[PDB]
Design a protein around this ligand. Structure first.
Ligand code: NA
Length: 98
């Protein structure tokens, strides 16, 4: 029963997916929804240093969506916004709900 609608918006350029990362994880994976923040809780299998969590986060979502993913907010924050270029909200929700 995970509802992603409060963590996404569809813009001129694609979809902005809003996440909150928890680093130091055994496995990169979606774990739930932070309804206070409107963000997907994502465990990231990387330490919080040297950009490594950013690289792993983008690798994971590029594979999931089959689209280019860039960080547009939160490069050095836990609360990161990911622009998935050229995609619709319907397609993103379908892939997140896998
Ligand atoms: Na929500």
């Amino acid at each position: 029963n995970l509802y992603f609608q409060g963590s996404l918006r569809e813009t001129s350029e694609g979809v902005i997916l809003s996440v909150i990362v928890a680093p130091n994880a055994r496995e990169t994976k979606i774990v739930g929804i932070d309804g206070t923040r409107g963000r997907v809780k994502v465990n990231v299998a990387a330490p919080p240093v040297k950009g490594k969590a950013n690289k792993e986060l983008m690798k994971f979502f590029k594979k999931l969506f089959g689209a280019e993913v860039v960080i547009v907010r939160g490069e050095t924050s836990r609360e990161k916004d990911l622009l998935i270029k050229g995609i619709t909200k319907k397609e993103v929700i379908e892939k997140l709900e896998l």
